[PDB]
Structures are given as structure tokens and as C-alpha cells.
């Protein structure tokens, strides 16, 4: 496989620090510029830095200059984006990407069109910038049900149903930020009346950045 | 600096049938070196984006001919002849001129024959209430199009701005959406009223309906 892996990520408080690595195998790193790029949850794609193979012409977004530091190890096929001093708007996902070059001259004193071409991308790494931390309790033709999942930080949670026995009809909703800065969401499941009493259901919740995972028997009226 | 602009912001289209997106720039795009510094990217839903076009009109390796890509200067276009359901996502033009800057997006989604939602209220439940809160959820299933107007009500009385609503992404097989609408309350004002009800108005309804409960 030709592949690129981001790394690092993770939550740390504002004015925090993080070093995102990004490793590459399956091609000649040295033949390509590299590019960080972010997606704030909810928002659209925002270029971050670029850098060439000769590890020169480091560009940065105004939103990012003076706080992030694009490094490179063509002999160790990696990419390093040193992040300081982190603020809230810095929360996003970070892809490292392959990019073609095409260079100078009538750019600044000598510049690079760092990546018109941009054909390979890692999966991303997520960087969460806020305070505080920790889990959030669950609590809960056709008739529905599901679980609420609430008062949790940070993202994500993995809501499941009977560990997987319900793939059908499960509408598990994007998490929205309550004012308090803790999220919540609901995981529902569409089901025919019938099942109640014989079929009994349980929502396999898992929030890691918490060391919490539960699930809860939904059973209307008694 | 340059400002990338695209239109529309969402393009529900129908597989078989073609579609077009526009992207424009606050400055002209060509030179260094002849021809344009504009790529286009898809981001299919739940995925990293991928190269689509490059230097404005070049079709990156392993890309269907369905995708022509045109223009010069400030005005640009991604015309997809014969969309297929898998082309869903966000199209992002991108600008290679001074460094790198990304289109605001164009969200592509499937067109579909309207369809109304089923509705469902859920009571707080005495576990939340033990912990002192009252969230009252109200589901909306498998409706199209997205635009819906859910309205909460305590004792005939509307509410305003105590309700947040999520929406799942289009459904991959039936192309519907769903929607939570959560109205949160202090357990103290929860326990003090009886009639909880949400009142949906979707276009696939000849008049609103409401689910209701008491306690
Ligand atoms: C840097 O890139 C260009 C083509 O992208 C190549 O011609 C040049 O030799 C490269 N430097 C390397 C591979 O060290
Ligand atoms: Zn459903």
C-alpha cells in the first residue's frame, strides 16, 4: 500500500502544545511536497502549511503562522507539524497530503506553487483544544427508542446496538455542543412494535477518553 | 489575499442526470508558468478528500471521464456528466496561486421524491431526573428534503430557543434524513407541567403533526 499516516492529535488545553507526526510509505517521499490541512468539525477544508522535498519554501496560513512549525525527514519519510500555542479555533482534523510542485521564479524571491496537485492523503488526526475533560452518562407500523448520550467530553463516542445485532434503522446523530462546552447526542433505532418484551434492546456505548462504556436496557412503561 | 468562492452551496442532483459547480477567485489564477492553478477535490462523506482535477482542467489518475473541469482566470467549473450515487460529498475547488487556499465547498446529495417523517417523543425518564435534568427528544425519520421545521410546545405554549437539533447525513440506500430535536429543561420546571409535544412541519405534510405526552 501507498499510504500516509497522521499521528499525535489528542486533546490539550488552550496555549497547549502538540507535535503531529505524519509517516509515509509506498512511494518516494523525496519526490513530493507535503501539506497539512485542517477541517474544523462542521467547517470546510482549510490548507495549513506546505513544504518541498528539498525541505524548503515553508508556507503557512495566516490563521496559523507563528504558532506551527512544518518539519521533514526525507530519510525517515515523516512530516512533523509542531503546534504551539494552541487556541480553540485550532480544533480540527489534520491530514498530511502528497502534492506536486512547480516552482518560482516570479513568486516572491523564488517561490513554489506548493501543490497544485494533491493526490494522496492520510486518514487524519484529531486535535481537540479545550477544557475540562471526562465522560458523559447515557440515560434513556413502527415505534422508536434509542439512548440519549450526554454531558460528555471530548469527542467521539461510539454508540452501538446489542454490540452490532442492530445495524438496521439506527439513526445516531451528530454530536452538538451544548453551551456548557460538553456535547450530547442521541442514538435511535427504528423498530416494529412487536419486538417489545421478547426482543429487548441495549445501546452499547463507548467513550474512551473517559474509561467509560455502558449500555442500557430500554423498556417502555412499568 | 485571494478569496475563493463557489456556487451553489448545496446541489441535490439525480444520478444519470448531469450537474455543474462553479468556483471563482478574487484574483486571476494563471502563471507562474502558462495554464491555471486550480484543483478540485471531492470529499466523500466520512473520508479524506482526494484529488479530482489539477491545474484547472487535468483529470488526476483514476478519475472517470464523467468529470470534465473547465474555465480560466477567476470563473471556473466542475461539470459532472452523469453523476452516480457515489459522487456524493463536498466539492472543494482549491487555489494554488499564492500558497494554498480552499473553496468554501459545494455539497452534493441525491434528489429524491419528497417523503414525510415519522415522529416520536421521549420522556425524560427518572435517572436523568434523579441527576436533575429534563431533555425531551423528538425524532423525525427518513424524510426528504432536508428542510423541516420542528416546533416544541409546553402547555399549548410555544417555546423559543431552548431547542437544539441534529440531522444525520443523507441515507446511503433510501436517501432520507433524520433529525433529533432536543428541548432541555430544569427538572424543577419539568415536574411542574404536564403536556409535552413537538409539532413538525415538513413539506411532505398537508398539515403539521405532533407527538404528545404527559408528566
Ligand atoms: C524535488 O522535486 C523535483 C520534482 O518534483 C525533482 O526533480 C528533484 O530532483 C527533487 N529533489 C529530490 C528528489 O531530492
Ligand atoms: Zn430510520
Amino acid at each position: 500500500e501507498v499510504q500516509l499516516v497522521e499521528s499525535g492529535g489528542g486533546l490539550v488545553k488552550p496555549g497547549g502544545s502538540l507535535r503531529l507526526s505524519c509517516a509515509a510509505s509506498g512511494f518516494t517521499f523525496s519526490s513530493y511536497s507535503m501539506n497539512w490541512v485542517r477541517q474544523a468539525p462542521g467547517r470546510g477544508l482549510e490548507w495549513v502549511s506546505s513544504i518541498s522535498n528539498t525541505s524548503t519554501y515553508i508556507y503557512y496560513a495566516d490563521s496559523v503562522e507563528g504558532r506551527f512549525t512544518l518539519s521533514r525527514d526525507n530519510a525517515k519519510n515523516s512530516l512533523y507539524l509542531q503546534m504551539n500555542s494552541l487556541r480553540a479555533e485550532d480544533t480540527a482534523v489534520y491530514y498530511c497530503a502528497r502534492a506536486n510542485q512547480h516552482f518560482d521564479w516570479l513568486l516572491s524571491l523564488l517561490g513554489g506553487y506548493h501543490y497544485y496537485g494533491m493526490d494522496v492523503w492520510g486518514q487524519g488526526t484529531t486535535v481537540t483544544v479545550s477544557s475540562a475533560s471526562t465522560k458523559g452518562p447515557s440515560v434513556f407500523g413502527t415505534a422508536a427508542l434509542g439512548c440519549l448520550v450526554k454531558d460528555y467530553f471530548p469527542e467521539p463516542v461510539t454508540v452501538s446496538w446489542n454490540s452490532g445485532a442492530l445495524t438496521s434503522g439506527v439513526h445516531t446523530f451528530p454530536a452538538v455542543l451544548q453551551s456548557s462546552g460538553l456535547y450530547s447526542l442521541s442514538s435511535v433505532v427504528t423498530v416494529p412494535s412487536s419486538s417489545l418484551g421478547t426482543q429487548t434492546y441495549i445501546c452499547n456505548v463507548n467513550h474512551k477518553p473517559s474509561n467509560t462504556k455502558v449500555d442500557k436496557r430500554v423498556e417502555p412503561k412499568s | 489575499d485571494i478569496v475563493m468562492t463557489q456556487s451553489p452551496l448545496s446541489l441535490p442532483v439525480t444520478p444519470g442526470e448531469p450537474a455543474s459547480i462553479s468556483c471563482r477567485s478574487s484574483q486571476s489564477l494563471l502563471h507562474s508558468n502558462g495554464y491555471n492553478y486550480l484543483d478540485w477535490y471531492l470529499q466523500k462523506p466520512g473520508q479524506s478528500p482526494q484529488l479530482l482535477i489539477y491545474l484547472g482542467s487535468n483529470r488526476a489518475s483514476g478519475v472517470p471521464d464523467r468529470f470534465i473541469g473547465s474555465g480560466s482566470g477567476t470563473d471556473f467549473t466542475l461539470k459532472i456528466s452523469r453523476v452516480e450515487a457515489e459522487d456524493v460529498g463536498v466539492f472543494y475547488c482549491m487555489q494554488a496561486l499564492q500558497a494554498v487556499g480552499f473553496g468554501p465547498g459545494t455539497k452534493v446529495e441525491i434528489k429524491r421524491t419528497v417523503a414525510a417523517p415519522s415522529v416520536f417523543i421521549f420522556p425524560p425518564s427518572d435517572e436523568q431526573l434523579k441527576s436533575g435534568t429534563a431533555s425531551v427528544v423528538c425524532l423525525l425519520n427518513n424524510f426528504y428534503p432536508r428542510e423541516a421545521k420542528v416546533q416544541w410546545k409546553v402547555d399549548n405554549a410555544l417555546q423559543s430557543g431552548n431547542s437544539q437539533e441534529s440531522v444525520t447525513e443523507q441515507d446511503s440506500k433510501d436517501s432520507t434524513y433524520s433529525l433529533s430535536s432536543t428541548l432541555t429543561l430544569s427538572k424543577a420546571d419539568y415536574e411542574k407541567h404536564k403536556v409535552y409535544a413537538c409539532e413538525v412541519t415538513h413539506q411532505g405534510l398537508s398539515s403539521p403533526v405532533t407527538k404528545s405526552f404527559n408528566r
Side-chain angles (χ1 to χ4, degrees), chain A residues 1-114 116-222, chain B:
Chain A
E1 249 149 25
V2 182
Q3 83 200 115
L4 294 173
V5 195
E6 295 88 25
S7 293
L11 99 121
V12 58
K13 306 180 83 83
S17 61
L18 274 203
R19 198 172 91 142
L20 320 194
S21 307
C22 150
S25 24
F27 64 116
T28 318
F29 203 47
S30 90
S31 264
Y32 302 99
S33 55
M34 295 286 297
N35 307 302
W36 286 87
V37 171
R38 60 187 188 175
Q39 192 140 51
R43 288 289 220 238
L45 277 175
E46 174 193 337
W47 158 85
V48 177
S49 256
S50 304
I51 193 154
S52 68
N53 50 346
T54 25
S55 185
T56 152
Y57 293 113
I58 305 173
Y59 297 165
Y60 285 85
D62 292 325
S63 72
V64 134
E65 304 223 50
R67 340 208 311 289
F68 306 171
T69 323
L70 231 198
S71 350
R72 219 183 146 142
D73 235 288
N74 301 267
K76 219 274 205 61
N77 285 355
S78 291
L79 206 70
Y80 316 98
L81 188 75
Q82 200 195 286
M83 288 167 169
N84 306 70
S85 54
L86 289 175
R87 56 179 90 125
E89 28 191 340
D90 293 325
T91 307
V93 183
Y94 293 101
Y95 306 89
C96 57
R98 275 226 306 217
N100 291 26
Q101 281 175 143
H102 258 65
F103 267 167
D104 308 348
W105 262 118
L106 64 151
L107 271 72
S108 294
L109 253 26
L110 44 134
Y113 288 100
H114 268 334
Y116 55 84
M118 209 168 45
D119 58 343
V120 185
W121 297 69
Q123 64 268 37
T125 254
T126 75
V127 174
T128 7
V129 177
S130 211
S131 32
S133 178
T134 58
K135 30 81 214 322
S138 268
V139 154
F140 186 68
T142 176
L145 60 95
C147 303
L148 169 119
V149 182
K150 147 142 170 144
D151 291 337
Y152 71 82
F153 206 87
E155 293 214 65
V157 184
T158 54
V159 205
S160 141
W161 288 97
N162 310 14
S163 307
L166 255 53
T167 46
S168 166
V170 186
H171 291 301
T172 286
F173 277 104
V176 307
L177 181 83
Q178 296 176 145
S179 94
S180 87
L182 305 184
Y183 307 109
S184 72
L185 54 84
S186 282
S187 181
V188 304
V189 54
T190 343
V191 282
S193 313
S194 301
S195 282
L196 338 146
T198 35
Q199 269 306 279
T200 319
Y201 312 93
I202 282 177
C203 71
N204 286 32
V205 175
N206 211 332
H207 182 218
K208 288 101 280 138
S210 72
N211 298 23
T212 63
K213 6 60 77 187
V214 219
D215 45 290
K216 274 308 198 90
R217 213 91 103 272
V218 186
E219 299 163 322
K221 272 262 190 174
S222 314
Chain B
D1 279 328
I2 317 172
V3 173
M4 297 307 321
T5 274
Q6 304 179 248
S7 49
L9 154 74
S10 29
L11 182 61
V13 272
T14 302
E17 253 87 51
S20 306
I21 294 89
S22 263
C23 160
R24 288 148 229 81
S25 47
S26 100
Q27 318 198 8
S28 177
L29 279 184
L30 65 141
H31 287 242
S32 285
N33 320 163
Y35 61 79
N36 273 125
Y37 285 69
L38 177 81
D39 332 310
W40 282 99
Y41 290 66
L42 210 226
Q43 201 182 15
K44 283 149 181 180
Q47 299 175 61
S48 308
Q50 83 229 35
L51 202 43
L52 271 203
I53 299 289
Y54 64 83
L55 297 161
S57 91
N58 296 134
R59 35 177 329 92
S61 284
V63 158
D65 345 40
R66 344 216 250 77
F67 305 76
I68 331 151
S70 41
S72 93
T74 37
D75 214 56
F76 283 123
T77 283
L78 189 58
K79 186 189 193 279
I80 310 155
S81 33
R82 196 177 172 92
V83 170
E84 84 168 55
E86 228 44 56
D87 301 333
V88 155
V90 188
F91 302 83
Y92 285 102
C93 69
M94 192 220 55
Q95 159 275 140
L97 213 246
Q98 285 292 29
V100 192
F102 266 102
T106 298
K107 179 173 202 38
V108 184
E109 289 213 44
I110 304 305
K111 209 155 74 204
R112 201 260 185 250
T113 52
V114 201
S118 320
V119 177
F120 313 72
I121 26 75
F122 308 84
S125 78
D126 14 298
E127 315 70 359
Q128 201 193 198
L129 299 156
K130 299 189 92 204
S131 344
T133 329
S135 300
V136 185
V137 190
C138 159
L139 173 57
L140 266 74
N141 203 13
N142 310 122
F143 46 98
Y144 187 96
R146 195 183 257 254
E147 22 291 15
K149 166 178 185 57
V150 165
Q151 229 96 336
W152 279 85
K153 218 153 272 185
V154 192
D155 302 354
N156 252 336
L158 280 68
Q159 321 299 143
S160 176
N162 44 346
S163 96
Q164 317 215 233
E165 49 186 57
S166 300
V167 200
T168 60
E169 290 301 280
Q170 195 159 22
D171 184 311
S172 341
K173 30 82 154 155
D174 70 20
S175 294
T176 77
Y177 302 77
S178 285
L179 178 149
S180 83
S181 203
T182 324
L183 194 161
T184 75
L185 293 198
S186 79
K187 129 89 192 177
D189 190 41
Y190 176 61
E191 75 190 285
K192 265 196 53 206
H193 315 314
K194 195 188 254 67
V195 158
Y196 296 123
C198 51
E199 193 219 39
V200 181
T201 127
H202 192 259
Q203 163 195 172
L205 289 188
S206 51
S207 86
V209 273
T210 108
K211 249 51 208 177
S212 155
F213 90 96
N214 313 278
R215 274 156 205 160

